[PDB]
Design a protein around this nucleic acid. Structure first.
Ligand code: SY5
Ligand code: MG
Ligand code: MG
Ligand code: MG
Ligand code: MG
Ligand code: MG
Ligand code: MG
Ligand code: MG
Ligand code: MG
Ligand code: MG
Ligand code: MG
Ligand code: MG
Ligand code: MG
Ligand code: MG
Ligand code: MG
Ligand code: MG
Ligand code: MG
Ligand code: MG
Ligand code: MG
Ligand code: MG
Ligand code: MG
Ligand code: MG
Ligand code: MG
Ligand code: MG
Ligand code: MG
Ligand code: MG
Ligand code: MG
Ligand code: MG
Ligand code: MG
Ligand code: MG
Ligand code: MG
Ligand code: MG
Ligand code: MG
Lengths: 101, 206, 127, 99, 82, 151
RNA sequence: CGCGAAGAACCUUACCUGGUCUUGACAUCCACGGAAGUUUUCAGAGAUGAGAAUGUGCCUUCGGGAACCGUGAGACAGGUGCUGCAUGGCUGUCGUCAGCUCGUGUUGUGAAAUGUUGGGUUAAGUCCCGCAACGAGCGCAACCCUUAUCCUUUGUUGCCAGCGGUCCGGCCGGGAACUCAAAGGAGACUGCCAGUGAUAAACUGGAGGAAGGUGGGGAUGACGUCAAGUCAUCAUGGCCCUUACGACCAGGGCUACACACGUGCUACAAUGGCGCAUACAAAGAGAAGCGACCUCGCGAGAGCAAGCGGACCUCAUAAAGUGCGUCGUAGUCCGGAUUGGAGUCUGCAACUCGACUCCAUGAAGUCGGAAUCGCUAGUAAUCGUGGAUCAGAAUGCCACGGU
């Protein structure tokens, strides 16, 4: 799916764990009300924007791991709907057989 | 009409899975992808080693790969050098230490993967596709199969309009779930494009 | 002594204990007028003891689980007959003609892909 | 105190020989066993489109079953604890111990 | 409707306004920030707001305060069908 | 049907009286599976037949059913490009089915407040051989001996 | 035509305007200089631009080696560019229709025929007779999954019949009976019997039985047809672009709006609306998640915050139903579109362009022309619940039960 689109996903994920899941303190408890309700929170709402436009966990598209498809994704397998069927008929997804109820 | 995949419908009936591990939803996609990497590497490296099937099994947090092969002396090598120039790279792809095991396919002429790879190499060598087709059907029935079918597809002999030609012998009951049907697929890359090959081999019921 | 029966209906399951002598009907520690608000449901639990005359002649201790109003009442009627056939063994051919021994095996059909319901198909148009 | 062992697998024949080996083996060195308990079977379901491009109403449906067995041992003698640790069963069976 | 704990503005617009207020106005101030809130500090300024291809000059009146800057630059060209 | 020919399905009696013709009448009235609400209308309408206009509760429903029952009907029988309206004798299980549907469909297009009162007046009008359910019956019989010559 | 899309504010994104790069955002090789990494700084919308502080690890051939960085040049990378009428793979469709062929023999100069036609019968080229055919293969059926009855084993986190106690809560000892959980086994075979039919097959009917004639439902799609769909999931022959048809960034667009069509949702009410009280489900999901109790808020929600990687904890209060009251056939106490104001939450960001809450507003619509669709039983109709996708965002989709 256009090689550079695969690279956008792998840069976004490296820059998000560079800053966030540690530098969430600016919104984690700086934006909730106690003695920090003065201009310090207002300094946070502005300081949270100078970190790069990436770095946020809500800009990851979650593509398929082999083909890079943006649609038809399944979080349980990490593959697109095409690749889970292509790989389930060969017996390579464990325990995943055809359901009949 | 479109047919069901004869291996997927028989999983847990007469056909086993090629992966035998357990995971929760946390490590399912990582075990599933890293098995794609270990399978992709072992197919590229054992290319002329006539490899049929790669069985991956994970104990507590190790992985061990069992390779079914027709030419085991080439996969092990001289002194046992290429089983661990294989296992220091498999353990680096899976992230856990590896223990490669090597099996045998005694008659490679009754394996759908090995029979399908024989036609693809010959079709890319510019061999008449009929003789490649009829030799695969003939060699299988003289070794005790109750049926075989082979099928080639797409621009046969460099023709502009593609055709599919198939040749059957014996008995291939794909609608019977008890039938031990061995089926696999291969692709030949020629100067006029891709020719797909499909092989069904029937070996008996139950 | 108690004579037990198990009856089941759509997704309901009923356990039934009968003791000799009373006209007591107790179900889930409730009486029948408090449990079944529907009089059709009231009249299908009385069916097997109206054919066989043990109305003031046999007590009944009932529990039910699952399903809804009419599903639970039908599971009880099936469970009372199984209890009364352990009691006598010769009320059987009386009850087979009443259709109370047949377990009604009609279940909900699953919703199918491409269909709006189990059988309802979306609206077709020629063009 | 009862030590409690839960076994999870995608296969029911593999899981029963994992129960049978730990049911074998606590009774090997003399413990109370209740035996195996079937916990409820979890079925995960999946429904994929099978065409690469359109045709919404053509699908395949897959599932993964997860089989559960529970056996508790309330004689944990010290011949038991490491003799329970020295046991080699299958790679498809997840064991989780817990007090 | 953003929640009541902080109105939003960019930093580069916030700082470019405050320097431009203490000097008298100017050129129209070029920005791409359609999402920033108009503040009380900006009454009298002219801000050229991007609309996709152009920058529409908006002279800030008092009653534009509280709105977003992108409300005063239409992003879509449309005039009739027939 | 062509091939799978059917037995019958069984109806339960009514609870208060033990009649299945009365239970077929509740089934025909029922909308959207709401069976408890159809018995409420049917029960309340029948005793408000009884002491408003004449006793013997369920005898009064059968006698109101005696008049709206057809004996002949018309049916179209195709030949080669010409369809005649042929008068047919109606069968006794089809007699009650047409009579109960015409009573229920007469009661829906009325001007009374409730449905249980619309039902009660249409059943009362059927006892006096008046109303619209009787005239639905009259038009069927008028067309049948109008096409007597195509028998 | 609620189709790819199982979920377009940025991202996704492939499109536009503008700003930028030219061996590159992605891979290998060569050479040199730097281990890297971290904090900070001002310009810029940002990509990028000019620097400061700092480190100088691990291997050590410790002339150096591998991870990572910069610069140079070249082979090259790159393309969601065109051709599905060059292809593979996969899929729709006739159609789950009962058909489609072959070997040998025989007939005909031959294309071909026979078999596979005929009499019955069947859901079935299903079976039996007849017959220049005798046999075989792919289909049919069966083997597989689920549901309906019973038996065996085990008995917690699930159960409570017999007992003791109780706060009268399965609640506590206890019990392994029952429901239930999931492994194994049995059971249905025209098996038995009458009658009809050609000493047939087979049919109608009856008994027993939880179930009776393939018991219900699913998976399973023959040889082929439409040069059907997809070069955009992927792969791939040919062609074409390469300081650009490639790469990076901000904002916009895919949500436009005289109009026409398809699929849906909600209605036009009294078999109802509203108000108070109170019953009976199945099945699913959960760790950068599900989130009880308690407190605040009219509410969406906020604070605090235990339990749960789960038959245990949570999501999570089923709704139709039942009892009482009111409205009394009205554009209505029916309908809830549209608009104004005030808010909550997710998220750098809710203007274009989110969902939800509160107050106010109270449109059309009174059952729909010609035409046209689905359904044969736990079905139609009606009523709630869950899941995937997913930060947020279903009237769609995939599942589950009630009547
Ligand atoms: C929505 N409801 C309203 C209602 O209840 O009447 N039903 C309808 O609109 C359909 C109407 N009842 C009948 C129509 O399909 C057949 N008539 C054909 C006319 C000429 N082809
Ligand atoms: Mg690619
Ligand atoms: Mg997202
Ligand atoms: Mg299919
Ligand atoms: Mg339903
Ligand atoms: Mg659809
Ligand atoms: Mg952009
Ligand atoms: Mg965009
Ligand atoms: Mg440009
Ligand atoms: Mg391309
Ligand atoms: Mg095509
Ligand atoms: Mg194709
Ligand atoms: Mg096309
Ligand atoms: Mg056909
Ligand atoms: Mg021949
Ligand atoms: Mg001849
Ligand atoms: Mg034919
Ligand atoms: Mg012929
Ligand atoms: Mg038959
Ligand atoms: Mg026939
Ligand atoms: Mg014949
Ligand atoms: Mg056959
Ligand atoms: Mg079959
Ligand atoms: Mg069983
Ligand atoms: Mg019978
Ligand atoms: Mg470009
Ligand atoms: Mg669109
Ligand atoms: Mg009322
Ligand atoms: Mg009205
Ligand atoms: Mg009007
Ligand atoms: Mg109202
Ligand atoms: Mg109103
Ligand atoms: Mg969501």
């Amino acid at each position: 799916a256009k090689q550079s689109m695969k690279a956008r996903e792998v840069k976004r994920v490296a820059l998000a764990d560079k800053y966030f899941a540690k530098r969430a303190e600016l919104k984690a408890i700086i934006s909730d009300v106690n003695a920090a309700s003065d201009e310090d929170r207002w300094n946070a709402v502005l300081k949270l924007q100078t970190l790069p436009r990436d770095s946020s966990p809500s800009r990851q598209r979650n593509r398929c791991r082999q083909t890079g498809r943006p649609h038809g994704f399944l979080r349980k397998f990490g593959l697109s709907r095409i690749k889970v069927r292509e790989a389930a008929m060969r017996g390579e997804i464990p325990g995943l057989k055809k359901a009949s109820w | 009409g479109q047919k069901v995949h004869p291996n997927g419908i028989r999983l847990g009936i007469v056909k086993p899975w090629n992966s035998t591990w357990f995971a929760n939803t946390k490590e399912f996609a990582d075990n599933l992808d890293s098995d794609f990497k270990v399978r992709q590497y072992l197919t590229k490296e054992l290319a002329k080693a006539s490899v049929s099937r790669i069985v991956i099994e994970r104990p507590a947090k190790s992985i061990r790969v069992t390779i079914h092969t027709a030419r085991p002396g080439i996969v092990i090598g001289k002194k046992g050098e290429d089983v661990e120039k294989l296992r220091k790279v498999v353990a680096d792809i899976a992230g856990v230490p590896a223990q490669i095991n090597i099996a045998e396919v005694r008659k490679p002429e009754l394996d759908a993967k090995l029979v399908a790879d024989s036609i693809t190499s010959q079709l890319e060598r510019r061999v008449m596709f009929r003789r490649a087709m009829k030799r695969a059907v003939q060699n299988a029935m003289r070794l005790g199969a109750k049926g075989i079918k082979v099928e080639v597809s797409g621009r046969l002999g460099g023709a502009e309009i593609a055709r599919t030609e198939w040749y059957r012998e014996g008995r291939v009951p794909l609608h019977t779930l008890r039938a031990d049907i061995d089926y696999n697929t291969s692709e030949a890359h020629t100067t006029y494009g891709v020719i797909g090959v499909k092989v069904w081999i029937f070996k008996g019921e139950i | 002594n108690q004579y037990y029966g198990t009856g089941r209906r759509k997704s309901s399951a009923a356990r039934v204990f009968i003791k000799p002598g009373n006209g007591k009907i107790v179900i889930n520690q409730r009486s029948l007028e408090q449990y079944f608000g529907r009089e059709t449901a009231r009249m299908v639990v009385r069916q097997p003891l109206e054919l066989v005359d043990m109305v003031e002649k046999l007590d009944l201790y009932i529990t039910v689980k699952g399903g809804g109003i009419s599903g639970q009442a039908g599971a009880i009627r099936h469970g009372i007959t199984r209890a009364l056939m352990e009691y006598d063994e010769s009320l059987r051919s009386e009850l087979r003609k009443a259709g109370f021994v047949t377990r009604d095996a009609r279940q909900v059909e699953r919703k199918k892909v491409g269909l709006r319901k189990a059988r309802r198909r979306p609206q077709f148009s020629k063009r | 105190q009862r030590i409690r062992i839960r076994l999870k697998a995608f296969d029911h024949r593999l899981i029963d020989q994992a129960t049978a080996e730990i049911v074998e083996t606590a009774k090997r060195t003399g413990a109370q066993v209740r035996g195996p308990i079937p916990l409820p079977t979890r079925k995960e379901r999946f429904t994929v489109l099978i065409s690469p491009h359109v045709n919404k109403d053509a699908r395949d449906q897959y599932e993964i079953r997860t089989h559960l067995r529970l056996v508790d041992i309330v004689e944990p003698t010290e011949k038991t604890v490491d003799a329970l640790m020295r046991l080699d069963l299958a790679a498809g069976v997840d064991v989780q111990i817990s007090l | 409707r953003s929640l009541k704990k902080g109105p939003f503005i960019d930093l580069h617009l916030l700082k470019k306004v405050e320097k431009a207020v203490e000097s008298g106005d100017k050129k129209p101030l070029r920005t791409w920030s359609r999402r920033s809130t108009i503040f009380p500090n900006m009454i009298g300024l002219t801000i050229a707001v991007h609309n996709g291809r152009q920058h529409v000059p908006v002279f800030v009146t008092d009653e534009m305060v509280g709105h977003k800057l992108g409300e005063f630059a239409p992003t879509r060209t449309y005039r009739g069908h027939a | 049907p062509r091939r799978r020919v059917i037995g019958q399905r069984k109806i339960l009696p009514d609870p208060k009286f033990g009649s299945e013709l009365l239970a077929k009448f509740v089934n025909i009235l029922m909308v959207d599976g709401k069976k408890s609400t159809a018995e409420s209308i049917v029960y309340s309408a029948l005793e408000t037949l009884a002491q408003r206009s004449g006793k013997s509760e369920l005898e009064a429903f059968e006698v109101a059913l005696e008049n709206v029952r057809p004996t002949v009907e018309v049916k179209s029988r195709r030949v080669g490009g010409s369809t005649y309206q042929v008068p047919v004798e109606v069968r006794p299980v089809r007699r009650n089915a047409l009579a109960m549907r015409w009573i229920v469909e007469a009661a829906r297009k009325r001007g009374d407040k409730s449905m249980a009162l619309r039902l009660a007046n249409e059943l009362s009008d059927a006892a006096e051989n008046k109303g619209t359910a009787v005239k639905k019956r009259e038009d069927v019989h008028r067309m049948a001996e109008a096409n007597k010559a195509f028998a």
